[PDB]
Amino acid sequence: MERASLIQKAKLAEQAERYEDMAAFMKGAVEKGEELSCEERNLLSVAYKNVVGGQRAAWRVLSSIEQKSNEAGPEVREYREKVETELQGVCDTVLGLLDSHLIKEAGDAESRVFYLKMKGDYYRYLAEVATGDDKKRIIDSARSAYQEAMDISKKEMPPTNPIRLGLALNFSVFHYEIANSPEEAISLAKTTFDEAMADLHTLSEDSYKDSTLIMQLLRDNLTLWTGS
Amino acid sequence: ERASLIQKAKLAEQAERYEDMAAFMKGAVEKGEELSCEERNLLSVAYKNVVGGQRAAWRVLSSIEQKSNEGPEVREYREKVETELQGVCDTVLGLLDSHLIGDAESRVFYLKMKGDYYRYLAEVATGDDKKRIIDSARSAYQEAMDISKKEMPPTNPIRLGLALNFSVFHYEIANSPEEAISLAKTTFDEAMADLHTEDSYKDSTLIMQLLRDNLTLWGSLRRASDPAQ
């Protein structure tokens, strides 16, 4: 069998910063149809986060140029469309993996939340580029994925859990940027922060590291969305 | 069309999409037309980044492969990366040889680029082949050095860049650390001499700084006397 080899190669690709290869290896490993361990889920996420991150960054540059020139010819639109299409291909691939293999009405709650957060994240990336037609559905598919994830995490995981914090952080970004609900973004972020803060002495070192890093991102967004 | 491919290559540079940038520049070249100064740099920037990423990865994987057996996945994947890297170098050398040609200034530039890409093949070549590739890199650089020395000022950034890379070739590839250091100091001392002199100062000085860096890396600067502390 080559599942273990695909996973070993994905770890090598991570060290070599070959994220497209990392994503492909993890995709193939998922497709062997066995659940992923904690380590393996993170490899899947790291890989696609980086792949899509690069496409999004590029799309932003190109879209920004396209808009500021509309008072550099058809080339900007054509190339922005190429990048956009490619990006959608990645999100569709990731959502295809989540729906066909990973998300299940079964198993522990953390991994359930992890995949639904991932589902919200990738529908949110589709929403970043979508036009009014697709937009509404997509925004809503992102909202339900996050909301379902939020409901589980709130009942099953501590407020200091990094998957829970990460979920809240991203859902608040969704509110601010995508849904155009800056109030619930600010509110969710403050609430998340304060609830986690109250529970910090229950966390000992090592877990405190992971969680305070995400709490620092919440504080940063809050300061940005308001004042220092 | 050609002008569109060049416009798209500029956009790809801004979006940091170097594989796309390389492909657009390849297509623009393929259309014969000599490249302007700006266009040559776009070609170089694109492939420098593409191959840079493959080299960095190859470095990591080869390093793991060597430290480890002192596991077939490492070899297989290192081979995949290596093969892909060779494909890029072969593509670039194919462009240089196929659509090479005009003037002395630009002739240096392409021969330097020819030396650079044969040097990247040498970074991974095994034996019978490695030894030949090293010479194709050496002649490309040497021919370019001879032109630059007779036609360009010692402050010229293409000339400085060529010297810098040829000296790297000597230390790393040819295992001639003596001429690598000789060449690198000679190059920086000859440029330092005529520094005061349009105004491309900052352009040139950046490459001078790389020569001192790589020389300090190979004691540090000049002799040491008692440091007051």
Numbering used by the authors:
A (entry chain A): 1 to 71, 77 to 233
B (entry chain B): 2 to 71, 78 to 108, 112 to 207, 210 to 230, 234 to 244
What does the paper say about this structure?
The 14-3-3 family of eukaryotic proteins are abundant, medium sized proteins (~30 kDa subunit mass) endowed with a well-characterized phosphopeptide-binding ability. The human 14-3-3 family comprises 7 isoforms (β, σ, ζ, γ, τ, ε, η), that form all-helical W-shaped homo- and heterodimers. More specifically, 14-3-3 s bind protein partners that have phosphorylated serine and/or threonine residues presented in a specific molecular context. To aid structure determination, we have developed a streamlined approach based on chimeric 14-3-3 proteins fused to the sequences of interacting peptides.
PKA-dependent phosphorylation and subsequent interaction of the transcription factor Gli, a central player in Hedgehog signaling, and the steroidogenic acute regulatory protein StARD1 with 14-3-3 proteins have recently been reported, however, no accurate structural information on these complexes was available. For chimeric protein construction, we have chosen the main phospho-site of Gli for pCH2 and the first potential 14-3-3 binding motif of StARD1 (RRSS57LLGS) for pCH3. The pCH2 crystal structure was determined at 3.2 Å resolution. There is one 14-3-3 dimer per asymmetric unit; forming a closed cyclic structure with its symmetry mate where a single subunit of each dimer contributes its phosphopeptide to the binding site of the closest subunit of an adjacent dimer having its own binding site occupied by a sulfate ion (sulfate was present in crystallization condition). In the inter-dimer complex, the central Ser640 is bound by the same canonical residues of AG as in pCH1 and other 14-3-3/phosphopeptide complexes. Interestingly, this binding mode leaves the two opposite AGs unoccupied by the two remaining phosphopeptides which are unresolved in electron density maps. Instead, these ‘unbound’ AGs appear to be occupied by sulfate anions present in crystallization media at high concentration. The quality of electron density maps allowed unequivocal tracing of all linker residues of the Gli-derived phosphopeptide, except for the C-terminal alanine. Interestingly, two closely packed phosphopeptide-binding 14-3-3 subunits belonging to two different dimers, form Cys38-Cys38 disulfide bridge. However, this interaction is distant to AGs of each subunit and does not appear to interfere with 14-3-3/phosphopeptide interactions.
